[PDB]
Ligand SMILES: Cc1cn([C@H]2C[C@H](O)[C@@H](COP(=O)(O)OP(=O)(O)O[C@H]3O[C@H](C)[C@@H](O)[C@H](N)[C@H]3O)O2)c(=O)[nH]c1=O
Ligand SMILES: Cc1cn([C@H]2C[C@H](O)[C@@H](COP(=O)(O)OP(=O)(O)O[C@H]3O[C@H](C)[C@@H](O)[C@H](N)[C@H]3O)O2)c(=O)[nH]c1=O
């Protein structure tokens with residue numbers, strides 16, 4: 161099964177996350193406000209692992225300039241179509257270099273859990289701090305911690321759009337120091353018939369302290385707020 | 401994709417048809433009342449293609465002796481477990497010979513559409529007539545008539561039981577004089593993880609006249625009533 165957010169899996173991403181109730185509007189509003197508490201005059205924002213560019217489309221209404229970075233060509237193409245006047249870069253959060261800084265650097269919906277190892281987590285946070293202005297803010301939404309992840313968790317939901325029915329079912333296990341989440345889809349419509357699709361991801365269960373250490377090593381002060389967009393909390397970092 | 405009602409598919413059958421809202425309890429009572437209209441003192445009943453024996457389990461409360469016939473060993477295993485004191489035969493509705501006759505011979509939920517052409521349909525009706533008492537009745541629930549079938553129809557539902565979630569989606573097309581219905585499942589539970597299953601059936605769209613021809617050739621009078629347990633109506637046949 162693919163792990164790379166490509167092809168039909170990428171094409172299905174928006175529909176299934178909206179169908180599950182993800183509200184990128186509220187999240188963007190909440191982000192913009194959190195960003196402004198820490199950095200009252202913030203003007204620009206880079207969203208790293210920006211996926212299909214849903215946060216970016218809403219954040220564009222709150223920030224003068226927004227920009228993205230995304231590893232998967234196929235997610236990125238959706239995001240560019242959604243954000244045709246923003247610059248969105250094809251690149252890797254572990255090692256990119258844009259030559260410019262932003263009032264905010266965000267990395268949402270546990271994209272950071274695609275990293276494996278303290279070294280990768282450290283590298284990425286060093287990048288974020290390399291792209292943040294001196295009076296701005298870095299925001300990283302973590303994955304679950306080892307101690308609060310619920311192994312055996314199943315999600316199942318169905319959404320219909322454009323005449324096509326899409327069912328998504330995930331199962332998640334504790335696979336060592338990461339969550340194995342295996343997701344299957346069935347997609348059906350009168351004219352297209354039925355097709356089955358599948359993806360599978362290891363999403364690293366970093367501990368709180370590992371994130372705190374990566375913020376620290378990057379020069380940032382770090383704070384953690386439990387709950388957050390997805391239940392997993394939110395870490396914010398200020399340069400210093 | 402299997403076409404033989406076996407393995408996991410046979411194990412998911414009752415749960416999926418329950419989830420879709422099938423009520424074998426009402427259907428058996430309705431069938432018991434139909435049978436006593438045409439044959440007031442009927443006392444025994446053979447359910448042909450009895451599947452998991454859901455009809456028989458309820459028909460046992462209305463008829464003193466029930467018996468089943470079923471082609472899939474795995475469906476039949478479930479039926480026997482459910483109907484421990486009835487005789488349930490492993491065999492083929494086209495060519496079976498039990499050496500006794502019943503007040504009612506029934507064949508429900510369009511199982512008759514698993515037959516390929518007029519010759520098979522005629523042969524199963526003649527076998528039904530061979531197992532019906534002279535003052536008894538044959539009941540056959542047809543598949544859709546060609547004019548009443550909707551190509552492109554999609555069914556999608558998700559049910560959960562025992563912490564296992566089961567999603568079933570089907571899509572149907574016109575294939576020569578039959579419906580091709582392709583059915584996919586996703587089944588996930590905390591311990592067993594997630595799996596995908598699929599089945600596919602060709603169910604013949606016999607016309608009303610083809611059914612009537614088969615009944616009449618078997619020496620049965622024939623009547624069709626629209627509606628019925630599934631929208632497809634019901635044929636009844638009386639010998640003599
Ligand atoms: C409700 C809940 C879920 N979880 C875990 C179980 C599973 O690993 C995840 C929810 O899985 P989902 O709803 O199928 O996934 P979600 O929409 O959150 O997306 C997640 O996985 C997908 C594959 C990634 O692309 C995405 N970046 C992740 O947020 O969070 C918990 O640990 N505790 C919980 O209370
Ligand atoms: C309600 C309705 C159904 N149909 C046809 C379309 C499709 O082929 C079928 C319903 O699909 P389903 O609900 O997925 O199938 P159902 O539960 O009726 O079961 C049927 O297909 C399965 C595979 C057989 O084991 C079962 N013996 C059949 O009755 O019936 C129509 O053509 N028009 C309709 O309005």
Ligand SMILES: Nc1ncnc2c1ncn2[C@@H]1O[C@H](CSCC[C@H](N)C(=O)O)[C@@H](O)[C@H]1O
Pocket residue numbers: 164165208209210211212214215229230231232235251252253254267268269270271274275
């Ligand atoms: N090393 C890496 N650098 C950049 N993006 C990455 C990455 N590894 C995974 N990703 C991206 O991480 C995203 C995880 S899904 C989250 C997408 C988006 N942030 C949203 O909130 O909806 C995917 O788009 C995936 O391609």
Ligand SMILES: Nc1ncnc2c1ncn2[C@@H]1O[C@H](CSCC[C@H](N)C(=O)O)[C@@H](O)[C@H]1O
Pocket residue numbers: 404405448449450451452454455469470471472475491492493494507508509510511514515
């Ligand atoms: N030639 C044949 N003889 C007997 N059973 C058959 C058959 N072809 C298909 N079947 C059976 O037909 C059934 C269709 S599903 C309907 C099962 C059951 N009558 C119910 O109402 O739930 C399955 O059990 C299948 O194995």
